[PDB]
Design a protein around this ligand. Structure first.
Ligand SMILES: [Zn+2]
Lengths: 295, 7
């Protein structure tokens, strides 16, 4: 006995338009922003640790560790200038999530990304759990000050190669991303404890589910809740080495998990098409892209 | 609160 009448994208679409599916949680990772030109900052193929010789770090990872950053922030900000995107244009996937919001289906979007594209696409603070923080805002690091600065201010400092200092107290100003050694956001744990009591559908897009504790969110869904993965590669299955709550797409025991393998944009397009939303999504994307291109 | 690590 299962909520999906078949373990396919078509089964998921029929379930979404049934009275049983009211509340959708999206879990998204780097795979939803690669088509916007944003690289996967956790992939070794990105080479974040490769050309740091001129910074004389005690070890490669120090560039992203909070205690090192606070005393030697220049390497991080030099790297941030080199990797700073040329444009912030959200993808079809981001705008699919905006449509979910528009239609009253979006309970929450948990994101591993720091690129701000969920916000640009129209998800509001209350819709989002930025599990690793964001570049959208930055804060003075002094506990007694904590002056907030917008991304436009931070970008100007990064591009002029001036280490960002607080105008009120002259302390370092840090983008609101979670550095290694920093606490994960309290909001991540608070929202998880409430949201997963309420979820009817998990949409997992563009994440290989390899980074904890984000990956463990799939095990927080009720046992009946269908879980759709839209991703270039299958992910989330229990590790035959390591291994509880893993994806089961393909066994005779499979009952609720569905994998659609391909580009995230094409998967969301296909799902929107099944839902009758394709024209709405095309119109939204073309309009928002036109607006961003015209800034 | 749990701190951010490699894993
Ligand atoms: Zn300050």
């Amino acid at each position: 006995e299962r909520l999906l009448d078949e373990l396919t994208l078509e089964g998921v679409a029929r379930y979404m338009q049934s009275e049983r599916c009211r509340r959708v949680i999206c879990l998204v990772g780097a795979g939803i922003s690669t088509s916007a030109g944003i690289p996967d900052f956790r992939s070794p193929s990105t080479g974040l640790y490769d050309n740091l010789e001129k910074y004389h770090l005690p070890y490669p990872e120090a560039i992203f560790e909070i205690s090192y950053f606070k005393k030697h922030p220049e390497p991080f900000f030099a790297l941030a200038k080199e990797l700073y995107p040329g444009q912030f244009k959200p993808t079809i996937c981001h705008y699919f999530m905006r449509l979910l919001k528009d239609k009253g289906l979006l309970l929450r979007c948990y994101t591993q990304n720091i690129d701000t594209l969920e916000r640009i696409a129209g998800l509001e603070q209350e819709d989002l759990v930025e599990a690793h923080g964001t570049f959208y805002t930055s804060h003075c690091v002094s506990a007694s000050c904590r002056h907030e600065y917008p991304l436009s201010w931070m970008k100007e400092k990064i591009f002029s190669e001036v280490t960002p200092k607080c105008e009120d107290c002259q302390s370092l100003v840090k983008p609101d991303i979670v550095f290694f050694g920093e606490s994960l956001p309290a909001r991540f744990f608070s929202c998880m404890q409430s949201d997963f009591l309420k979820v009817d559908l998990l949409l997992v897009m563009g994440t290989s589910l390899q980074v904890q504790p984000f990956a463990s969110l799939i095990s927080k869904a009720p046992l009946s809740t269908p879980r759709l993965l839209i991703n270039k590669e299958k992910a989330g299955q229990s590790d035959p080495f390591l291994g509880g709550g893993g994806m089961d797409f393909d066994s005779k025991k499979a009952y609720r998990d569905v994998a659609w393998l391909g580009e995230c944009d094409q998967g969301c397009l296909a799902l929107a098409e099944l839902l009758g939303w394709k024209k709405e999504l095309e119109d939204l994307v073309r309009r928002e892209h036109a607006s961003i291109d015209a800034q | 609160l749990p701190k951010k690590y490699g894993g």
